[PDB]
Enzyme design. Structure first.
Site, PDB file in Angstrom:
ATOM      1  N   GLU A   1     -14.965  12.254 -30.349  1.00  8.19           N
ATOM      2  CA  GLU A   1     -14.657  12.182 -31.781  1.00  8.19           C
ATOM      3  C   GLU A   1     -14.398  10.755 -32.271  1.00  8.19           C
ATOM      4  O   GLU A   1     -14.135   9.855 -31.474  1.00  8.19           O
ATOM      5  CB  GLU A   1     -13.452  13.080 -32.107  1.00  8.19           C
ATOM      6  CG  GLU A   1     -12.210  12.831 -31.258  1.00  8.19           C
ATOM      7  CD  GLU A   1     -12.283  13.451 -29.872  1.00  8.19           C
ATOM      8  OE1 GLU A   1     -12.118  12.703 -28.882  1.00  8.19           O
ATOM      9  OE2 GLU A   1     -12.520  14.673 -29.771  1.00  8.19           O
ATOM     10  N   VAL A   2     -14.471  10.577 -33.591  1.00  6.77           N
ATOM     11  CA  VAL A   2     -14.261   9.281 -34.246  1.00  6.77           C
ATOM     12  C   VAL A   2     -12.972   9.317 -35.064  1.00  6.77           C
ATOM     13  O   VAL A   2     -12.750  10.251 -35.839  1.00  6.77           O
ATOM     14  CB  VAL A   2     -15.449   8.896 -35.163  1.00  6.77           C
ATOM     15  CG1 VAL A   2     -15.180   7.600 -35.925  1.00  6.77           C
ATOM     16  CG2 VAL A   2     -16.724   8.748 -34.349  1.00  6.77           C
TER      17      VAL A   2
ATOM     18  N   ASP B   1     -34.444   7.631 -33.641  1.00  6.25           N
ATOM     19  CA  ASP B   1     -33.805   8.834 -34.183  1.00  6.25           C
ATOM     20  C   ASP B   1     -33.415   8.658 -35.655  1.00  6.25           C
ATOM     21  O   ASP B   1     -32.362   9.147 -36.089  1.00  6.25           O
ATOM     22  CB  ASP B   1     -32.572   9.188 -33.330  1.00  6.25           C
ATOM     23  CG  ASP B   1     -32.131  10.651 -33.482  1.00  6.25           C
ATOM     24  OD1 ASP B   1     -32.979  11.526 -33.776  1.00  6.25           O
ATOM     25  OD2 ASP B   1     -30.922  10.917 -33.280  1.00  6.25           O
TER      26      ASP B   1
ATOM     27  N   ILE C   1     -12.048  11.466 -38.361  1.00  2.00           N
ATOM     28  CA  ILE C   1     -12.992  11.381 -39.486  1.00  2.00           C
ATOM     29  C   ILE C   1     -14.450  11.683 -39.091  1.00  2.00           C
ATOM     30  O   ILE C   1     -15.372  11.378 -39.848  1.00  2.00           O
ATOM     31  CB  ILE C   1     -12.881  10.009 -40.198  1.00  2.00           C
ATOM     32  CG1 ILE C   1     -13.143   8.854 -39.227  1.00  2.00           C
ATOM     33  CG2 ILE C   1     -11.503   9.866 -40.831  1.00  2.00           C
ATOM     34  CD1 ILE C   1     -13.387   7.530 -39.912  1.00  2.00           C
ATOM     35  N   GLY C   2     -14.646  12.313 -37.933  1.00  2.00           N
ATOM     36  CA  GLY C   2     -15.984  12.603 -37.401  1.00  2.00           C
ATOM     37  C   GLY C   2     -15.898  13.199 -36.004  1.00  2.00           C
ATOM     38  O   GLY C   2     -14.998  12.843 -35.235  1.00  2.00           O
ATOM     39  N   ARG C   3     -16.824  14.104 -35.678  1.00  2.00           N
ATOM     40  CA  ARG C   3     -16.816  14.818 -34.393  1.00  2.00           C
ATOM     41  C   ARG C   3     -18.213  14.895 -33.772  1.00  2.00           C
ATOM     42  O   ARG C   3     -19.211  15.068 -34.476  1.00  2.00           O
ATOM     43  CB  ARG C   3     -16.236  16.226 -34.564  1.00  2.00           C
ATOM     44  CG  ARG C   3     -14.713  16.276 -34.574  1.00  2.00           C
ATOM     45  CD  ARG C   3     -14.198  17.689 -34.824  1.00  2.00           C
ATOM     46  NE  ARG C   3     -12.790  17.855 -34.449  1.00  2.00           N
ATOM     47  CZ  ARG C   3     -12.326  17.970 -33.199  1.00  2.00           C
ATOM     48  NH1 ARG C   3     -13.143  17.929 -32.143  1.00  2.00           N
ATOM     49  NH2 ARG C   3     -11.018  18.120 -32.996  1.00  2.00           N
ATOM     50  N   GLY C   4     -18.255  14.756 -32.446  1.00  2.39           N
ATOM     51  CA  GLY C   4     -19.490  14.817 -31.660  1.00  2.39           C
ATOM     52  C   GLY C   4     -19.318  15.696 -30.434  1.00  2.39           C
ATOM     53  O   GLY C   4     -18.266  16.314 -30.237  1.00  2.39           O
TER      54      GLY C   4
HETATM   55  O1  LIG Z   1     -21.776   7.701 -34.460  1.00  4.29           O
HETATM   56  C1  LIG Z   1     -21.482   8.161 -35.546  1.00  4.29           C
HETATM   57  N1  LIG Z   1     -22.081   9.274 -36.046  1.00  4.29           N
HETATM   58  C2  LIG Z   1     -23.097  10.046 -35.321  1.00  4.29           C
HETATM   59  C3  LIG Z   1     -22.543  11.443 -35.025  1.00  4.29           C
HETATM   60  C4  LIG Z   1     -21.370  11.344 -34.088  1.00  4.29           C
HETATM   61  C5  LIG Z   1     -20.076  11.600 -34.539  1.00  4.29           C
HETATM   62  C6  LIG Z   1     -19.007  11.507 -33.655  1.00  4.29           C
HETATM   63  C7  LIG Z   1     -19.240  11.155 -32.322  1.00  4.29           C
HETATM   64 CL1  LIG Z   1     -17.933  11.021 -31.197  1.00  4.29          CL
HETATM   65  C8  LIG Z   1     -20.530  10.903 -31.874  1.00  4.29           C
HETATM   66  C9  LIG Z   1     -21.594  10.999 -32.759  1.00  4.29           C
HETATM   67  C10 LIG Z   1     -20.483   7.457 -36.367  1.00  4.29           C
HETATM   68  C11 LIG Z   1     -19.579   8.052 -37.151  1.00  4.29           C
HETATM   69  C12 LIG Z   1     -18.739   7.191 -37.863  1.00  4.29           C
HETATM   70  C13 LIG Z   1     -17.697   7.493 -38.768  1.00  4.29           C
HETATM   71 CL2  LIG Z   1     -17.348   9.155 -39.080  1.00  4.29          CL
HETATM   72  C14 LIG Z   1     -16.995   6.484 -39.364  1.00  4.29           C
HETATM   73  N2  LIG Z   1     -17.275   5.208 -39.113  1.00  4.29           N
HETATM   74  C15 LIG Z   1     -18.233   4.870 -38.269  1.00  4.29           C
HETATM   75  C16 LIG Z   1     -19.003   5.840 -37.615  1.00  4.29           C
HETATM   76  S1  LIG Z   1     -20.326   5.716 -36.471  1.00  4.29           S
END
Ligand SMILES: O=C(NCCc1ccc(Cl)cc1)c1cc2c(Cl)cncc2s1
Ligand SMILES: [Cl-]
Ligand SMILES: [Cl-]
Lengths: 621, 339, 63
Positions: free
Chosen positions: A178-179, A291, A171-174
């Protein structure tokens, strides 16, 4: 729903755990009553197993309901209701009357129709006074403190792996990973799991960023902030680091700004209010975020928001930072200037820059959609902000305040922090307690539907102290899911064993009537592990199997030392024995290991000290 | 001053006592007993091995029926055994782990024990209710309890690391009489058959004879070069034997007021832990730190034989009143009955 | 110390004030005791195995 089940240890764990807690000064009314699970076990004892304390806890919980009432009209109604009814039992109780001082204080407010949330605070203080003496001592003797120790032992033995979670879709990528959304198998609570890949971290040289976020989450995650993405657990595998975080399904506010287009003042007001309370939380714990920007604001399924990534945040309590950190377009003058130290002041400038972008579609120091970072930084330090005619005077006041280049002039930097921003004309319509309770309606409901190598000892030692569990988060998770059911099931199991031991006739305790220091289960060992029940006395360590008295032992004289050692993965105790022999012990939890290590060392050192000055007992040349 | 004059009178009296004793030394026991036959090879064998203690045995005592005995152990228990069968009559878990001694009442109704608790604890065996429980805890001593012996059901004598011995009235739980005199820890004691006298041995390297009725040291016996760990009356009350860290046992006569014999061997360098005579007094049996018990001809000083069955220190021993059997207790955790 | 030295002199006065017999007579009385009780000492003078509870004795009493 929970797929896995938590298993509590037997009541006999008390012998060890009570001592562990006692040596840390954790067996006190204040320490236990202020813990979620401690409170629940204490109220159970008082409401159901001790009649003299029952009305004290009943009245305590009535006052706590009164504290939570939103409007004064309600507090006028309750304060009457409470004072009229069942105060009469307290006044008629010979052991427990409230003080003249307390009643004169409460009647003084009430007599003038003054009904604040802390109207009954004097009565709380005298209830706690009456609960923390003999009542607490009787609680400590009860099976409800035994049950606390059983729960506490589980808490202090948490070792999380990927098998303790039911992982679902990404549900999220960095950059470093990833998340995923996940359910915790113990309890069934939904969480976000942020997985950071170590091979990637070493490749791109992001070790410090990964560690810092870990530290910063620790500082911030206490107190249950509704407006920050807080941590409950941190853990790591050989290849991955893992944060267990508040789940936020609704996407980030940059994405929504890009779909929705710019917001109105009224919609921005909602986001600004919730964000302010998040920053306040951080600033009271001496963390500067640094930030703050739309992409670091996340929406939940209902549209409410939290602040996200703490990897660039900084603890300013001891040393104030001075390095230029954050995103261009949102960084303060005191941040951009090398050599100038800055505190929380930076976040209030950032806020002004973000709130402006929510209204207009760009940072106020980003002219003509430019990508020149040197220009943007330069406008920040020298360009006065041309605010449009479109903006209201209240908004204009707020943004003029937040975007002051001088810190000594800037809003939220004049002495009282977030309170200065809260009382700005822009927010005049808001009840700030209602903001905190997430009661205002969100303006946007989200729609429902390469190559790395070489992980060595050097790198793994960077994450030696990575694992963490935050006590109040775990206890809150447990309390609201499985606590009730697992307590009832464990009561059944213990009753069965009690009634069965009556049938067998083995209903005598070997630890009583003697000088037993401590007792409990441990495992001794050529290949396989023999689990047995141990009793420690001042001159010896005995053990038994099931349904028998002890038939073997070690004396304290024989023991030359007590040291920790890893056999395979799990830690163990190594007793070096007189005449080049060994005895290895494995404990069922970390607290048990710590206590047995300590008590054995104390017992052997004291015994050998006694023996040496007794001619009949000591070794002769 | 006053002190200098009293130091000089102390040697004058000590020298008078030396010379008085020297005036009585007209022959040796060795010379007197040269005509009597040797005893020959005494070859006793283990007839019982009593298993139950989980750790070192420190002391034992036969009951007057020559059948039951009590043992005390590092495992924090007293065990009362039936030697004829090896059956346990009672296992008594003590309140204190640090027991060092134990005793059996002549009646067989009570046992006593103690140690680093500094308390002599009396246990009632056949109670009116049913079970074995503490009837009395005798507190008073400033140091560990090293030995104790009943005179009757209401009276017991004790010795302590505080340097004193004491007579107790068990009903009142009070010291009827205190016996001060020893310079260092008191290790053992032994009652005379008639019970009007008793002897104690101590880490001051001396044995003292005490009057029970009056509460006084009558005689003091020196000669040992180290701690006295054990002591035993000769059957007729006129003499006693001691056992020491100097690796010798010694026979002392009360009326001659001196040493008669030394029981020693060049090859034996370890300490004596316990001593007891045979029924007629002819054999003196001693337990040692080398894991053996040696059997001495008390009259001639020859070693008659050895009890060699334990795998660690022989810590204690006793001969039955009927004379049928010797019991040894050891650090290896077993007792053996020999004859 | 003054008190402790005065106790000792009194005590040694008592020890010296005893009367003593000859070692030859004392030793003679011990020898005679042993000889008078030798037949009754089962460690010196073995009994038949049938009257020895730890060898071959048939019958025993209660306790
Ligand atoms: O840190 C989060 N966003 C910052 C961008 C990011 C995304 C993935 C990575 Cl690996 C690193 C950094 C977070 C995302 C979520 C989600 Cl999509 C869902 N729930 C909590 C949280 S905290
Ligand atoms: Cl994964
Ligand atoms: Cl919500």
């Amino acid at each position: 729903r929970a797929s896995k089940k938590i298993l509590l240890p037997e009541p006999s764990i008390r012998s060890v755990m009570q001592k562990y807690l006692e040596d840390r000064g954790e067996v006190t009314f204040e320490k236990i009553f202020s813990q979620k699970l401690g409170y629940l076990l204490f109220r159970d004892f008082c409401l159901n197993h001790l009649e003299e304390a029952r009305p004290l806890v009943e009245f305590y919980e009535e006052i706590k309901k009164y504290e939570k009432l939103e409007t004064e009209e309600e507090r006028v109604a309750r304060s009457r209701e409470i004072f009229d009814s069942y105060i009469m039992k307290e006044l008629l109780a010979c052991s427990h009357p409230f003080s003249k001082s307390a009643t004169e204080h409460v009647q003084g407010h009430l007599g003038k129709k003054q009904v604040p949330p802390d109207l009954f605070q004097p009565y709380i203080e005298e209830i706690c006074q009456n609960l923390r003496g003999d009542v607490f001592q009787k609680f400590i003797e009860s099976d409800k403190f035994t049950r606390f120790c059983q729960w506490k032992n589980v808490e202090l033995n948490i070792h999380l792996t990927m098998n303790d979670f039911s992982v679902h879709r990404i549900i999220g990528r960095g950059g470093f990973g990833e998340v995923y959304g996940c359910r915790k198998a113990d309890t069934g609570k939904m969480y976000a799991m942020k997985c950071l890949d170590k091979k990637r971290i070493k490749m791109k040289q992001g070790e410090t960023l990964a560690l810092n976020e870990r530290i910063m989450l620790s500082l911030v995650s206490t107190g249950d902030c509704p407006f920050i993405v807080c941590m409950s657990y941190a853990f790591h595998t050989p290849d991955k680091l893992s944060f267990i975080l508040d789940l936020m399904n609704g996407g980030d506010l940059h994405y929504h700004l890009s779909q929705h287009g710019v917001f109105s003042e009224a919609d921005m007001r909602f986001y600004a209010a919730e964000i302010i309370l998040g920053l306040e939380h951080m600033h009271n714990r001496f963390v500067v975020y640094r930030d703050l920007k739309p992409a670091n604001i996340l929406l939940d399924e209902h549209g409410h928001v939290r602040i996200s990534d703490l990897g660039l945040a900084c603890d300013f309590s001891k040393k104030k930072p001075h390095a230029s950190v954050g995103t261009h377009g949102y960084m303060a003058p005191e941040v951009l200037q090398k050599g100038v130290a800055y505190d929380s002041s930076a976040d209030w400038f950032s806020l002004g820059c973000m709130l402006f972008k929510l209204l207009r579609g760009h940072s106020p120091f980003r002219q003509h959609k430019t990508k020149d970072k040197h220009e943007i930084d330069r406008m920040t330090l020298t360009m006065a902000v041309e605010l449009p005619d479109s903006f209201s005077p209240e908004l204009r006041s707020l943004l003029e305040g937040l975007l002051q280049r001088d810190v000594n002039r800037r809003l939220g930097c004049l002495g009282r922090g977030a309170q200065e921003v809260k009382e700005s004309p822009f927010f005049r319509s808001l009840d700030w307690q209602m903001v905190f309770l997430q009661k205002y309606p969100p303006p946007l409901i989200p729609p429902r539907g390469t190559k790395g190598i070489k992980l060595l000892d050097s790198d793994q030692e960077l994450y030696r102290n990575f694992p963490l569990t935050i006590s109040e988060r775990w206890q809150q998770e447990v309390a609201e899911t499985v606590f009730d059911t697992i307590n009832a099931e464990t009561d059944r199991l213990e009753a069965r064993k009690k009634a069965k031991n009556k049938q067998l006739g083995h209903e005598e305790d070997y630890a009583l009537g003697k000088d037993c220091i401590m007792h409990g289960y441990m495992s001794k060992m050529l290949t396989q592990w023999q689990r047995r029940y141990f009793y420690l006395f001042p001159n010896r360590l005995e053990w038994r199997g099931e349904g028998e008295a002890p038939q073997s032992l070690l004396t304290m004289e024989e023991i030359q030392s007590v040291e920790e050692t890893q056999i395979k993965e799990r830690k163990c105790l190594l007793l070096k024995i007189r005449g080049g022999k060994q005895f290895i012990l494995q404990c069922d939890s970390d607290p048990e290991l710590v206590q047995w290590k300590k008590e054995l060392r104390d017992a052997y050192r004291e015994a050998q000290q006694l023996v040496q000055r007794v001619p009949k007992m000591k070794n002769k040349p | 001053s006053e002190l200098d004059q009293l130091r000089q009178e102390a040697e004058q009296l000590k020298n008078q006592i030396r010379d008085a004793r020297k005036a009585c030394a007209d022959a040796t026991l060795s010379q007197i007993t040269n005509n009597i036959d040797p005893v020959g090879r005494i070859q006793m064998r283990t007839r019982r091995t009593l298993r139950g203690h989980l750790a070192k045995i420190y002391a034992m005592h036969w009951g007057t029926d020559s059948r039951l005995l009590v043992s005390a152990s590092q495992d924090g228990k007293l065990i009362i055994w039936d030697s004829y069968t090896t059956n346990k009559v009672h296992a008594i878990p003590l309140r204190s782990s640090w027991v060092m001694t134990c005793a059996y009442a002549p009646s067989g109704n009570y046992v006593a024990c103690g140690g680093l608790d500094n308390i002599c604890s009396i246990y009632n065996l056949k109670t009116r209710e049913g079970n074995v429980r503490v009837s009395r805890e005798l507190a008073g001593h400033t140091g560990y309890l090293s030995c104790c012996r009943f005179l009757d059901d209401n009276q017991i004598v004790t010795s302590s690391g505080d340097t004193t011995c004491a007579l107790w009235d068990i009903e009142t739980g009070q010291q009827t009489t205190t016996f001060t005199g020893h310079t260092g820890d008191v290790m053992s004691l032994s009652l005379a058959p008639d019970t009007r006298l008793f002897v104690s041995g101590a880490c001051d390297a001396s044995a003292k004879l005490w009057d029970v009725r009056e509460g006084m040291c009558r005689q003091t016996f020196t000669g040992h070069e180290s701690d006295i760990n054990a002591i035993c009356f000769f059957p007729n009350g006129n003499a006693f034997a001691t056992g020491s860290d100097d690796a010798t046992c010694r026979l002392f006569d009360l009326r001659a007021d001196q040493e008669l014999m030394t029981y020693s061997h060049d090859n034996i360098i370890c300490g004596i832990t316990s001593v007891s005579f045979s029924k007629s007094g002819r054999l003196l049996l001693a337990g040692y730190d080398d894991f053996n018990c040696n059997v001495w001809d008390a009259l001639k000083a020859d070693r008659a034989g050895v009890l060699a069955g334990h795998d660690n220190r022989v810590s204690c021993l006793g001969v039955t009143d009927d004379g049928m059997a010797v019991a040894t207790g050891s650090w290896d955790s077993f007792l053996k009955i020999w004859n | 110390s003054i008190a402790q030295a005065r106790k000792l002199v009194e005590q040694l006065k008592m020890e010296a004030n005893i009367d003593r017999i000859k070692v030859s007579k004392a030793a003679a009385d011990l020898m005679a005791y042993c000889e008078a009780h030798a037949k009754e000492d089962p460690l010196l003078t073995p009994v038949p195995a049938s009257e020895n509870p730890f060898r071959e004795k048939k019958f025993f009493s209660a306790i």
